[PDB]
């Protein structure tokens, strides 16, 4: 009689619909309810949960037919949790203008176009064959289908409810079906014994919201939870001191940074943006606040980008002397510059800021915190510097230097970054090219322009800490999610 798995979590997503549920807390539940056409095999070839290999999943097989289309042959006889059969109608609907990237679709799925390539309408060729295609060249279609965009939704059930209502009673093909939701309290899923893959190893999975990390640690010790999420390196000594418990940490594919409202005169040019960037001592912050567990990326560059990761790229320079020279050159008059942070929404946001204020003070710059309260939306005109995070959500360099800093995106259109014409032309080229010498060199060049312009200042890649009973064999993955396929066994 399979064990019931209980996870003490920091929170639940606003929705369980695949796209509207994208958040820190959603993928760990969504990944169990749905399957995609392509699955990231994180543990392939002995990898410690950080492999980027993409393998077939609801797609039995696929072939790329040109620089913008792929023909998919789907697995046959696979059912959704409502008993409806999964067909090309459902895969076409999932990536259709109707549900995902059309003008009317983004009214209820706001990020449908933002998390998508330049889609063209899917083509249903037969019951189990579908061509998925872009209007312009794209060798990233496979990476996108193996991403948090990929989950396949049932067409008729999804249409009869709409995206918002579907988010509260989701139906997928995954190993665990939805049972119940108590808003901001718990989600319970039950084993789908009609699953097409291996039999699910837990009878139920309950995601129990426990707000304080101390109460979650207490619940792991008392026997209330099997796994607990959202801990820091500081909680590792207490948890590991118990013989029957252990922490299981991993670097996650996220990026903490600070950025600027470049519509403000003081940030309309790169000079003070770069002085602020060079005065920051990233290894001191990482040692003081993260017990040396977080990683400082060697540019806008991470191993999970695959072919567009450069392991020879020199690290971000810390140069107080050059920062001092750029402050005088900018004509900075000494007016305090605000740094908007919503308390500690991002882990260690306020302590990292307080360290950086001293670093900026050494360079001759007064930066003051503007700790806004939860539920407040500071207006754009009142922001100078602000903290930010960016999920590096594709196994490619496209996200987020091109997806957030590229042409027509947030940092240029809303926050006023006047990017050089070269940066924008290289952003459009890497979106269309196949991996190789040209695409990698273009990514190296984009990183050089990003560092010289400083539209944002990368701080570090955070380290996520889980804790679990030694009688539950489960390893975290290097992404903000939980994978139980081939990764959950009870001793």
CA count, 13 A, side-chain hemisphere, 276? 32
CA dihedral 15, 18, 19, 24 (to 10 degrees): 70
Classify residue 174 by burial, with Cβ atoms within 10 Å: 0-12, 13-18, 19+: buried
Mode of pairing for the β-strands spanning 38-40 and 123-126: unpaired
CA count, 13 A, side-chain hemisphere, 36? 24
Pick the CATH number of 37-163 from 3.40.50.620, 3.90.76.10, 3.20.20.450, 3.40.50.150: 3.90.76.10
Tell me where in the chain the CATH 3.40.190.10 domain(s) lie. Answer: 1-34+174-252+463-491
Task: Extract the tokens encoding 191.
Answer: 């084993």
Classify residue 170 by burial, with Cβ atoms within 10 Å: 0-12, 13-18, 19+: buried
Q: Which long-range contacts (CB under 8 A, 24 or more apart) does 326-329 make?
A: 326/271, 326/272, 326/274, 326/275, 326/278, 327/272, 327/275, 327/363, 327/364, 327/365, 328/364, 329/271
Over its C-alpha atoms, the chain yields an Rg (Å, rounded) of 23
Sign (positive/negative) of CA torsion 2, 250, 462, 440? negative
Q: Which residue in the block uniquely carries the two structure tokens 């893959």?
A: 197
The conformational region for residue 348 under phi > 0 = left, psi -120 to 50 = alpha, else beta, is left
**Helix 349-362 to helix 282-289 angle, to the nearest 10 degrees?**
140
Mode of pairing for the β-strands spanning 385-391 and 38-40: unpaired
**Helix 270-278 to helix 320-330 angle, to the nearest 10 degrees?**
160
- Give the integer Cα–Cα distance in Å for 7 and 25: 12
Q: How was this structure determined?
A: X-ray
Give the resolution to one decimal, in Å: 1.8
> Are 296 and 414 spatial neighbours (Cβ–Cβ below 8 Å)?
no
Exposure b/e, 301-336, CB count within 10 A at least 16 = b? bbbbbbebbbeebeebebeeebbbebbeebebeeee
**Rounded to an integer, what is the distance from CA 405 to the centroid of its chain?**
16
- Give the integer Cα–Cα distance in Å for 405 and 212: 35
Mode of pairing for the β-strands spanning 337-341 and 254-260: unpaired
- Give the integer Cα–Cα distance in Å for 221 and 243: 11
Discontinuities in the chain with C to N beyond 2.5 Å fall right after none
- Give the integer Cα–Cα distance in Å for 454 and 415: 13
- Give the integer Cα–Cα distance in Å for 421 and 367: 31
- Give the integer Cα–Cα distance in Å for 182 and 28: 17
CA count, 13 A, side-chain hemisphere, 286? 17
**Helix 421-432 to helix 437-453 angle, to the nearest 10 degrees?**
150
Tell me where in the chain the CATH 3.90.76.10 domain(s) lie. Answer: 37-163
Exposure b/e, 80-115, CB count within 10 A at least 16 = b? bbeeeebbbbbbbbbbbeebbbbeebbebbeebbbb
Q: Which residues pair with 207 in a beta bridge?
A: 7, 187
- Give the integer Cα–Cα distance in Å for 71 and 411: 35
- Give the integer Cα–Cα distance in Å for 51 and 234: 27
> Are 42 and 55 spatial neighbours (Cβ–Cβ below 8 Å)?
no
> Are 157 and 168 spatial neighbours (Cβ–Cβ below 8 Å)?
no
> Are 474 and 488 spatial neighbours (Cβ–Cβ below 8 Å)?
yes
Find, among 217, 201, 297, 288, the residue nearest to 254 by Cα: 297
Backbone phi and psi for residue 433, each to the nearest 5 degrees, phi listed first: -80, 155
Fold of 254-461: Dipeptide-binding Protein; domain 3 (3.10.105)
What's the start-to-end Cα distance of the chain, in Å? 13
> What CATH class has 1-34+174-252+463-491?
alpha beta
C-alpha distances (whole Å) from 61 to each of 13, 37, 52 are 32, 9, 19
- Give the integer Cα–Cα distance in Å for 229 and 165: 27
Longest dimension (CA), the chain: 72
Find, among 487, 461, 455, the residue nearest to 473 by Cα: 487
Find, among 275, 205, 116, 150, the residue nearest to 490 by Cα: 205
Give the 3-state secondary structure of the chain: CCCCEEEEECCCCCCCCCCCCCCCCCHHHHHHHCCCCEEECCCHHHCCCCCCCEEECCEEEEEEEECCEEEEEECCCCECCCCCECCHHHHHHHCCHHHHHCCCHHHHCCCCCCCCCCECCCEEEECCEEEEEECCCCCCHHHHHCCCCCCCCCHHHHHHHCHHHHCCCCCCCCCEEEEEEECCCEEEEEECCCCCCCCCCCCEEEEEECCCHHHHHHHHHHCCCCEEEEECHHHHHHHHCCCCEEEEEEECCEEEEEEECCCCHHHCCHHHHHHHHHCCCHHHHHHHHCCCCCECCCCCCCHHHHHHCCCCCCCCCCCHHHHHHHHHHHCCCCCCEEEEECCCCCCCHHHHHHHHHHHHHHCCCCEEEEECCCCCCCCHHHCCEEEEEEECCCCCCCCCCCCCCCCCCHHHHCCCCCCCHHHHHHHHHHHHCCCCHHHHHHHHHHHHHHHHHCCEEEEEECEEEEEEECCEECCCCCCCCCCCCCCCEEC
Nearest-5° Cα angle at 415, 409 to 416: 90
- Give the integer Cα–Cα distance in Å for 191 and 205: 8
> Are 134 and 64 spatial neighbours (Cβ–Cβ below 8 Å)?
no
CA dihedral 295, 299, 303, 309 (to 10 degrees): -170
**Helix 270-278 to helix 437-453 angle, to the nearest 10 degrees?**
90
C-alpha distances (whole Å) from 90 to each of 63, 101, 156, 261 are 19, 15, 8, 42
């Amino acid at each position: 009689d399979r064990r019931a798995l209980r996870i003490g979590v920091n929170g639940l997503p606003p929705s369980l619909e695949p796209i509207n549920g994208i958040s820190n807390t959603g993928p760990r539940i969504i990944n169990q309810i749905f399957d995609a056409l392509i699955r990231r095999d994180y543990f392939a070839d002995g990898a410690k949960g950080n492999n980027i290999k993409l393998v077939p999943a609801l797609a039995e097989s696929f072939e790329r037919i040109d620089d913008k289309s792929i023909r998919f042959k789907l697995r046959q006889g696979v059912k959704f949790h409502n008993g409806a059969e999964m067909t090309a109608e459902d895969v076409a609907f999932t990536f259709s203008s109707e549900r995902l990237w059309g003008d009317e679709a983004i009214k209820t799925v706001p990020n449908g176009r933002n998390y998508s390539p330049n889609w063209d309408e899917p083509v249903v060729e037969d019951k189990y064959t579908v061509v998925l295609r872009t209007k312009t060249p794209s060798y990233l279609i496979e990476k996108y289908l193996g991403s948090w965009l990929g989950p396949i939704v049932p067409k008729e059930y999804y249409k009869s409810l709409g995206a918002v209502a579907f988010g509260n009673k989701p139906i997928g093909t995954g190993p665990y079906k939805f049972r119940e939701l108590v808003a901001n309290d718990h989600v319970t899923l039950e084993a789908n014994d009609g699953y097409w893959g291996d039999k699910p190893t837990a009878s139920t999975i309950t995601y129990q919201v426990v707000a304080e990390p101390a109460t979650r640690v207490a619940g792991l010790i008392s026997g209330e939870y099997d796994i607990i999420t959202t801990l820091t390196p500081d909680d590792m000594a207490l948890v590991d001191g118990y013989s029957d418990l252990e922490t299981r940490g991993t670097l996650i594919e996220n990026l903490h940074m600070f950025t600027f409202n470049m519509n403000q005169p003081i940030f309309q040019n790169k000079t003070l943006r770069r002085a602020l960037a060079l005065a920051v001592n990233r290894p001191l912050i990482v040692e003081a606040l993260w017990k040396n567990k977080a990683s400082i990326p060697n540019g806008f560059n991470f191993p999970h980008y695959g072919a567009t990761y450069d392991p020879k790229r020199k690290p971000m320079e810390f140069n107080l002397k050059e920062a001092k020279r750029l402050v005088k050159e900018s004509g900075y008059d000494g007016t305090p510059i605000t740094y908007h942070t919503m308390g500690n929404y991002y882990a260690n946001a306020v302590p990292a800021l307080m360290m950086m204020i001293e670093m900026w003070k050494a360079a001759g710059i007064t930066v003051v915190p503007k700790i806004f309260a939860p539920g407040t939306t500071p207006k754009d005109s009142d922001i100078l510097i602000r903290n930010w995070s960016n999920g590096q959500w594709l196994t490619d360099g496209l996200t987020t230097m091109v997806s957030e800093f590229g042409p027509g995106r947030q940092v240029q259109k809303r926050w006023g970054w006047k990017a050089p014409a070269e940066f924008n032309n290289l952003c459009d080229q890497v979106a269309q090219l196949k991996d190789g010498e040209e695409r990698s060199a273009a990514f190296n060049r984009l990183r050089d322009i990003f560092e010289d312009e400083a539209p944002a200042v990368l701080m570090y890649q955070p380290y996520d800490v889980y804790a679990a009973r030694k009688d539950v064999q489960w390893s975290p993955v290097s992404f903000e999610t939980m994978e139980f396929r081939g990764n959950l066994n009870f001793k």
